[PDB]
Design a protein around this ligand. Structure first.
Ligand code: 57O
Ligand code: 57O
Lengths: 157, 155
């Protein structure tokens, strides 16, 4: 049915009557996150994985697994985090894919992104460059994931 | 040149000794935005153009121009904002491109992005779905641009 809602949105864009996001779109996204039972985290360090896993378990009742392959094979692309997400989508079966990496060019800070079964971007969050930041990574990852969930109306509480 | 710094970064990644962003990279980004001489705003829109312009004229001493053509056609792609940025990049020349649109799928909130001459993503910022923050486009675009500049050390 997501295909249907997005189709409605696209029809609205075609007819030049679209004004931003619709409530049914957002609730479809939230329902998609909350009702997810399989989640893949596309990084090899387990710290990251634990943070993300335990956060996501309070939002959904999913099996959350990690990725055996390492994704440095994305640190040469234009948007590394997204590329990691797409690699994970290509080699692993899930209803949600969670990725974290560099936003764009070297120096651009960090991005965490959540993709669905067909590679659509559901939500994302950013952190300043670790260069200026100088704060811990687990707390920063927690901040990223919580903002990414909250900005689409999902409470970790 | 940015080509060299990025090449070194890529080399570190190849030899698997890369640890993250380095200060000469960030300094190259700041260097890139502050010393811009031309900035293109990827919109036909009044509100947006003036909003972005007012910040950017106070951060740099560039000619800041708008787009004769409008980029609503990007609202059917996977990441509309980036696509808008690439359209602007594709049809007119500048040292900076500022684009603003939907992050991803319908319902996913908004993204503002800043691109260099070669379409590289220098910085970006995100907003919750307009469904949730019921603020309209000019308050949060300013918040987005200011956040995007601040996150890379630009005041
Ligand atoms: C067309 C369009 C859309 O469908 N969604 C958004 C994000 C939002 O409404 O929060 C934007 C900015 C937009 O330009
Ligand atoms: C390889 C790599 C990089 O060059 N930059 C960043 C962003 C940062 O340093 O905050 C990340 C996360 C990263 O994995």
């Amino acid at each position: 049915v997501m295909e249907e809602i997005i189709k409605k949105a696209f029809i609205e864009s075609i007819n030049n009557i679209r004004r931003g996001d619709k409530e049914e779109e957002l609730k479809k996204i939230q329902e998609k996150i909350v009702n997810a039972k399989k989640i893949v985290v596309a990084t090899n360090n387990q710290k990251k994985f634990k943070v993300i896993r335990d956060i996501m378990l309070r939002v959904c009742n999913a099996e959350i697994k990690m990725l055996d392959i390492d994704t440095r094979f994305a640190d040469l692309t234009r948007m590394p985090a997204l590329t990691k997400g797409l690699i994970a989508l290509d080699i692993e079966k899930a209803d949600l894919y969670i990725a974290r990496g560099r936003l764009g060019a070297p120096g651009s800070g960090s991005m965490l992104v959540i993709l669905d079964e067909k590679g659509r971007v559901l939500t994302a969050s950013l952190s300043p460059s670790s260069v200026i930041h100088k704060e811990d990574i687990e707390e920063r990852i927690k901040k990223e994931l919580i903002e990414a969930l909250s900005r689409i109306g999902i409470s970790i509480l």
